[PDB]
């Protein structure tokens, strides 16, 4: 670790949520639930704050093995 490791870690934490949106299964899960809502025609309900809720939880079980393997490597 060094002074420059902070800004590389800090700079990464700033841009973190854009990668999770564009290079992680969370994009797949989000669409599937909205596709169901359209089939039923219920575009008010359930709220996106609900569907996007279940989707991020389920994605955790999938990606976690890749993150644990990394910080222990570093």
């Amino acid at each position: 670790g060094n002074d420059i490791s902070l800004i590389a870690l800090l700079a990464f934490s700033t841009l973190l949520p854009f990668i999770i949106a564009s290079g992680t299964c969370f994009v797949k899960f989000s669409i599937v639930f909205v596709m169901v809502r359209n089939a039923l025609g219920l575009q008010q309900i359930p709220s996106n704050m609900t569907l996007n809720g279940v989707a991020l939880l389920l994605s955790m079980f999938v990606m976690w093995p890749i993150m644990h393997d990394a910080y222990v490597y570093f």
Binding site: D3, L6, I7, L10, A11, T14
Partner: protein, 60 residues
Amino acid sequence: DNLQTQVTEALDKLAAKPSDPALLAAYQSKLSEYNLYRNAQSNTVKVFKDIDAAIIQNFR
């Protein structure tokens, strides 16, 4: 470090006979050499430990 141990010994000779002109001169040096080092080190740590603070205050 020797400098820390070296002063402790020069002090212990004076404590035995503080009136010898040869012994007094020797301790004057080692006591001067010790005072500077403690200060130069304290400042340097203060500098470095606040750079690492600004670099965290910048990014949030």
